[PDB]
Amino acid sequence: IIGPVLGLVGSALGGLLKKI
Numbered sequence: 001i002i003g004p005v006l007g008l009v010g011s012a013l014g015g016l017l018k019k020i
Helices: 004-019
Strands: none
Touching: none
């Protein structure tokens, strides 16, 4: 991927959303 950052944050973004 052009930027693994956007991909990694997006992952933690769904994990934080789980209990959000």
